[PDB]
Amino acid sequence: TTFGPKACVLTIMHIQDPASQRLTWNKSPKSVLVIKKMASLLQPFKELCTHLMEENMIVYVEKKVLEDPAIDESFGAVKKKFCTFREDYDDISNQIDFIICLGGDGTLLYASSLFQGSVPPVMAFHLGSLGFLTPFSFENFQSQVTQVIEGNAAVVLRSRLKVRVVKELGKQAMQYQVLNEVVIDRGPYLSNVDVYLDGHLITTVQGDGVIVSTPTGSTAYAAAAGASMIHPNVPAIMITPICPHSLSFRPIVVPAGVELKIMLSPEARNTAWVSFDGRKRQEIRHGDSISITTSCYPLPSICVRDPVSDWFESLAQCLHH
Amino acid sequence: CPVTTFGPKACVLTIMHQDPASQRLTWNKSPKSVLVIKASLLQPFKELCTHLMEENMIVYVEKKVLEDPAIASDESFGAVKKKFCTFREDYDDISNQIDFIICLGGDGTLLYASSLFQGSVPPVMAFHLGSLGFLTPFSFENFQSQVTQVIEAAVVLRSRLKVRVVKQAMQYQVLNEVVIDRGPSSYLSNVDVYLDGHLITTVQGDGVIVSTPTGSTAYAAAAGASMIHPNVPAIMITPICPHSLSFRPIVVPAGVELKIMLSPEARNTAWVSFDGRKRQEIRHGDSISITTSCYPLPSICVRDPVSDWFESLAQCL
Amino acid sequence: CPVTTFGPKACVLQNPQTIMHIQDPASQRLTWNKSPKSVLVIKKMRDASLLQPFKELCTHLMEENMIVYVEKKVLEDPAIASDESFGAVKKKFCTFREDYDDISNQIDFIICLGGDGTLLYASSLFQGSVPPVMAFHLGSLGFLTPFSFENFQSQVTQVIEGNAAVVLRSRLKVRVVKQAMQYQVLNEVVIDRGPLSNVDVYLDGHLITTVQGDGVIVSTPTGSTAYAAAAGASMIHPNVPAIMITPICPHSLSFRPIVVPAGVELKIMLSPEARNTAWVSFDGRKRQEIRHGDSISITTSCYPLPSICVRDPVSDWFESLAQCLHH
Amino acid sequence: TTFGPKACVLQNPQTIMHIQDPASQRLTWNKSPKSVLVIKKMRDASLLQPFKELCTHLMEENMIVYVEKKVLEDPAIASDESFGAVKKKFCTFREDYDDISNQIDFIICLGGDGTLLYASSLFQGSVPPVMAFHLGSLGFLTPFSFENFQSQVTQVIEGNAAVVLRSRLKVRVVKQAMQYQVLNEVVIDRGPSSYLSNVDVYLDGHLITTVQGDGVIVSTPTGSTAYAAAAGASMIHPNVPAIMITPICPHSLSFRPIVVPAGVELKIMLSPEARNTAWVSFDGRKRQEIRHGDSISITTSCYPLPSICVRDPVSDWFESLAQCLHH
């Protein structure tokens, strides 16, 4: 904090080291929500659920998972002991102690959509490929699940973005938590979307649109639009234009504490559309604003080895293929 | 600052202790020595140095600056020219003699300041005359009052990389980047990149750039990297014209240790550069270790860390 | 002239059915079999800077005893409607309705005021043979507007009375079979996803890939400075015979833009596994859904757009490129 | 062709060009081939058995087989006692010392990558027909599978095989005038200079831009899958007549890759204000310094490389593209 022989820097933040973080259970978990990728995961699902119940724990699954014809007379005993919820009708946000994901892709996106406030710890398993969000192998799953419950497992606090859509009626405000990104794209050539950073007009996006992503979302849609692969321990917000009219408009990475305000330019002839992790697509009209900030509710991803090692392994596998 | 509770039963159990957007400069003692680093700049150089001396301060400059016939022929500036405290770039170490640095003109003035201060760096106040750039936020108009205001200020702590080359061990502090390229070799490079001891990949292409957020607007930008705000703690790995098009630029946490060396199967040698200078050959068995330096470059703001960068981007776009 | 002998013993047989007879793309000139009488004037919409040049050019063309056509909506604009001086001229225009009237065989040559969509709007009106297009720039040079409005009278006269140079800007013929519909595009045909696309791309009957990404742009060398430019394509001189296939934000980063010969036939359709529908658009217009079983067949049109040159096809593009890289 | 109701383009004999259809070209032997040059990919053990098999067959078919001296020096070839009889019957040449340009009737390449580059460097005039085999992956320049090679080699010798005439660039370096033929590209880079390059690019005498970056790649459609691919260029079918100009890590992000007509003349030289020197490479070989006053003139060569086809120019490339996008 000393700069040369006479100067120094004089507000102080208290953050735990992202590389040293571990999970703690104030009380032993009892309710577990199981999420599986929407056929190879049928036997692992059946095996996991039987184990969790034999370990005296209430298992939650979406109603549609048990409706699948593949889900068996032998599994009937377990099938009857499940706690089911309906995705579009039921709120299980405050009922779940722990989350287990079977398979990759949108399992963690789906977990994030169910938990729009505090997110319970997430243990993600891979069956097919390693991916970036599923570090655990299903081999010796019983001992690993036990070590996560009984021990102090390492975690990556995968940041999320808080997205507030204010629409003129009074006014109506809608809040969304995105794990990967928030896309603002043109309606059916040139969008006219104004991007403000901490109150400063940064630019008017003219092109297909803009992706505002988290380091977790750096391997998602933004990757395809020219963004960098960002380790989930890097505190930042990424702004990636989609097919910009100005080729000089390169992807941008800003500090996690900035506030983004996105709205249609007053001169905008056409409307724009906003999407939250590819879901809940809705129109942005004149007078409507989208405010993006880093959420105070990150997704706690449990680790196999540690935050750095797990991502490096996923990167090494990514660059081997 | 995230909520540390995860659902109804879990939470997180090493604790680190300043907001990068709220940082300001403090003088334990008033500055007495200023280092000035700089044809369009000749009159503002004379103007500034006459002002700094009139404000009772020892002004340091490199010997070659005063050797210039534009400075040497000026008889009026002969009184000031004699009062400067000179140093020789390659022979003299002024690292612990300078209290504050002033840069005239853009480009490699900050790179040059970084090379002179391989330990703690005094605060840098950079002026632009031509274009705004990304590292020169101050306008030379009303400089007298601006400098008075800086002495009697907001700052960005621009991180640097600590580079260790073992072939004999050599240490270098780089402000922008360290480039490892194939040099005169036609054949694609065979550079092994290790992150915290883990072999990530073998770079096959023109090479790899390992940069700081400050260096993101430099060479890495041209190689497909993102523009990273200097308040983001991170190290960047950008391949140069990679053979695999899927090999995207990478941004890693500031606390990782990078190890770069030739692949055992490498038929040709690689070359390492430090902020474009001190180019040298990398042979088999030689290693380049890269970590974030504990000595960042303190760049003084015209407005604030966020606003300054946004305007440099507004001018860029 | 390439040497047709390959080493001491081999060569390529120079057969009459293999030798093509193409007019030099760099040496082409315009000829009037009869003097033009009708002119179509197209001006960039909602640009106030073009109002005075429009009125000036229209007054001149009529004073040169010629029927000046404009779309009805152009004269409806309050900027034109409020001007009392332009009344005499305003009454002498032949107006047509964009969506109702076919002026394809009534127009002798076209004049464009400003860049952007002016030329693609001309292409949409002429789905068969296209009359000569003389495009003017007011703001920046651009790539499709070579003429300066300074001394326009003499230039318009030189184009009518002389043998002006031309670039035959190729177009694509697009057949949509859902019922068959035919479209001519100057720049591109975009096949994009609805709110991961699963669009199959066939080249001369061969399935090349399934596009998982935002979609695909199939463009002409003229379209290379348009939408495809923003999606990572190259700038292609309009005298280069080719079809461009540019993916939009592909899932596979290794999927680079592709340039194929002008004589290939592209067939685009939804992959059998496509859960969502795709959308096809023609120079950003006439957007329509693509369902399972529907096909889009793309070939080079036999009706290219004749763009009049200030100097020549090569010189004009080089000048536009030099100005493009100066900015 | 007509353009609207009254205009057309004058079809003049001095304007009409007589170009061979690139899709219809086939190989003809004026005399049966006797001397074959065999080129195999360096540091690849998988090609050793195919090499031995091929060279035993060619000699059994009473033909003189040429190989570079270093190929037979390899311990894998040198130790094999069974291959000794064939090893003694080869005509060896020394790469940089011997000129075999007028001794070879036919070229066979084993494996991809630099094999065709190496063939091109040996034949700076007329190039004998090239039959390229793939063992590992299909690639873009090796269409033949080594399975049933005997019958394929015979069909190429006894028949009228289809051919792609892969254009080359003629490069004249005046620094003393030297001439070079490149199959893929000519690179002009900043070399060891920390400072951004200052390379002036002229197209048909017109100064287009000053490249300030790592440098510029001037490539052929064949070279589009080589170095230029890595620098942001498009994949161009080898039947597209064109020259490609791709900047390497340009200082201006707006500087996109460019595709120009095959008949343009490029002149590259240092900007008068250039503080540092540039370096010119020819297919990654013969690297040399470019000082003030030195010029590089690039045009399409009159000696293209005749690549023999498995099926045809279009089909072969589409298959290579389909395999490229499958991986």
XYZ file of C-alpha atoms in Angstrom, chain C residues 1-13 17-25 27-38 104-108 129-132 166 168 203-204 206-209 224-226 228-230 232-237 239-242 244 252 254-262 264 302-306 314-315 317-319 321-325 327, chain D residues 1-10 14-22 24-35 101-105 126-129 160 163 165 203-204 206-209 224-226 228-230 232-237 239-242 244 252 254-262 264 301-306 314-315 317-319 321-327:
190
model
C -3.071 -16.807 -69.706
C -2.027 -19.941 -67.702
C 0.430 -22.394 -69.295
C -1.629 -25.536 -70.144
C 1.390 -27.950 -70.111
C 2.293 -29.653 -66.816
C 5.881 -30.866 -66.863
C 7.361 -32.734 -69.845
C 4.529 -35.316 -70.480
C 1.159 -33.984 -69.175
C -1.289 -31.184 -70.208
C -4.989 -30.233 -70.035
C -7.134 -30.852 -73.187
C -17.348 -27.269 -74.192
C -14.768 -26.371 -71.459
C -13.784 -22.881 -72.766
C -16.110 -20.129 -71.420
C -16.796 -16.816 -73.238
C -17.196 -14.109 -70.575
C -16.966 -10.339 -71.244
C -14.071 -8.773 -69.206
C -15.677 -7.627 -65.876
C -14.046 -3.475 -69.406
C -17.922 -3.577 -69.439
C -19.812 -0.442 -70.697
C -23.555 0.543 -70.928
C -25.412 0.997 -74.290
C -28.844 2.600 -74.920
C -30.749 0.922 -77.809
C -33.179 3.882 -77.460
C -32.745 7.119 -75.410
C -34.164 6.790 -71.821
C -37.468 8.587 -71.070
C -38.342 7.251 -67.582
C -40.470 -3.481 -63.575
C -40.962 -2.804 -67.325
C -41.749 0.966 -67.100
C -38.314 2.208 -65.798
C -35.478 2.960 -68.268
C -33.904 -7.674 -65.615
C -32.665 -4.581 -63.685
C -32.307 -1.131 -65.391
C -28.921 0.705 -64.995
C -20.638 -0.720 -65.275
C -22.591 -6.242 -62.955
C -23.884 -27.742 -51.264
C -24.736 -29.260 -54.664
C -24.056 -32.768 -50.331
C -24.913 -32.200 -46.634
C -22.010 -30.120 -45.357
C -23.066 -29.336 -41.769
C -19.757 -8.702 -48.186
C -19.681 -5.081 -46.880
C -23.244 -5.513 -45.393
C -21.835 -10.673 -43.324
C -19.053 -8.081 -42.524
C -20.403 -7.862 -38.951
C -16.789 -12.085 -39.633
C -16.823 -12.287 -43.441
C -14.195 -10.851 -45.852
C -14.598 -7.857 -48.140
C -15.029 -9.273 -51.641
C -14.566 -7.181 -54.833
C -15.966 -8.716 -59.963
C -15.054 -11.922 -58.078
C -17.502 -14.718 -59.116
C -18.560 -16.344 -55.794
C -20.423 -16.520 -49.450
C -18.126 -24.304 -33.151
C -13.621 -23.463 -35.973
C -16.578 -22.804 -38.386
C -15.029 -20.027 -40.470
C -16.802 -17.981 -43.224
C -16.736 -19.839 -46.580
C -16.488 -18.582 -50.182
C -17.715 -21.051 -52.858
C -17.958 -20.880 -56.727
C -20.919 -18.875 -58.221
C -23.066 -23.971 -56.739
C -29.204 -14.595 -64.248
C -30.280 -10.986 -63.623
C -27.374 -9.038 -62.000
C -27.757 -5.409 -60.836
C -25.893 -3.055 -63.251
C -11.626 -1.914 -60.126
C -10.788 1.842 -59.481
C -13.915 -0.262 -55.272
C -10.216 0.471 -54.506
C -11.152 4.166 -53.811
C -11.595 0.588 -49.790
C -8.902 3.312 -49.372
C -11.539 5.676 -47.817
C -12.879 2.773 -45.645
C -9.352 2.102 -44.212
C -11.674 6.321 -41.409
C -27.692 -8.986 -71.608
C -30.533 -6.437 -71.442
C -31.005 -4.077 -68.440
C -34.595 -2.891 -68.302
C -36.568 -2.082 -71.461
C -33.993 0.121 -73.341
C -30.429 -0.572 -72.034
C -27.913 -3.441 -72.533
C -24.139 -4.076 -72.438
C -22.227 -4.064 -75.766
C -12.018 -7.287 -77.812
C -13.910 -7.381 -74.421
C -14.833 -11.129 -74.465
C -12.280 -13.357 -72.607
C -11.801 -17.102 -73.343
C -11.291 -18.873 -69.944
C -11.306 -22.652 -69.319
C -14.126 -23.917 -67.001
C -12.359 -24.719 -63.662
C -14.474 -29.219 -66.325
C -10.619 -29.512 -66.489
C -9.084 -33.064 -66.998
C -5.459 -34.372 -67.298
C -3.942 -35.711 -70.591
C -0.591 -37.557 -70.987
C 1.102 -36.708 -74.341
C 3.491 -39.594 -73.430
C 3.195 -42.207 -70.615
C 4.960 -41.019 -67.347
C 8.290 -42.722 -66.473
C 9.767 -40.612 -63.610
C 12.387 -29.371 -62.350
C 12.718 -30.901 -65.847
C 13.343 -34.560 -64.795
C 9.941 -35.354 -63.145
C 6.888 -36.503 -65.160
C 5.622 -25.655 -65.137
C 4.488 -28.119 -62.395
C 3.969 -31.869 -63.162
C 0.584 -33.391 -62.058
C -8.093 -38.634 -68.245
C -7.867 -31.779 -62.028
C -5.515 -26.023 -61.269
C -3.401 -2.412 -55.680
C -2.914 -1.769 -59.425
C -3.262 2.685 -56.016
C -2.036 3.050 -52.414
C -4.758 1.344 -50.397
C -3.376 1.436 -46.854
C -6.984 -19.915 -47.311
C -6.898 -23.078 -45.109
C -3.192 -22.335 -44.176
C -4.436 -16.803 -43.328
C -7.090 -19.041 -41.638
C -5.406 -18.398 -38.272
C -9.092 -14.369 -39.637
C -9.456 -15.164 -43.343
C -12.289 -17.107 -45.057
C -12.095 -20.613 -46.527
C -12.045 -20.096 -50.297
C -12.838 -22.881 -52.830
C -11.894 -22.681 -58.253
C -12.646 -19.109 -57.150
C -10.335 -16.804 -59.200
C -8.945 -14.382 -56.534
C -6.502 -12.637 -50.672
C -7.112 -1.023 -36.603
C -11.933 -2.520 -38.521
C -9.279 -3.796 -41.035
C -11.029 -6.919 -42.317
C -9.526 -9.609 -44.652
C -9.912 -8.671 -48.360
C -10.529 -10.768 -51.499
C -9.616 -9.107 -54.843
C -9.764 -10.237 -58.566
C -6.939 -12.612 -59.794
C -4.714 -7.392 -59.934
C 1.256 -17.022 -61.657
C 0.934 -18.479 -65.184
C 2.101 -21.837 -63.760
C -0.656 -23.228 -61.439
C -0.179 -26.450 -59.435
C -2.250 -29.270 -61.050
C -16.260 -29.165 -56.417
C -17.014 -32.628 -54.812
C -13.504 -29.678 -51.541
C -17.095 -30.155 -50.224
C -16.037 -33.580 -48.761
C -15.232 -29.144 -45.757
C -17.790 -31.688 -44.420
C -14.958 -33.610 -42.623
C -13.476 -30.277 -41.361
C -16.849 -29.262 -39.761
C -17.448 -32.813 -38.379
C -14.211 -32.679 -36.254
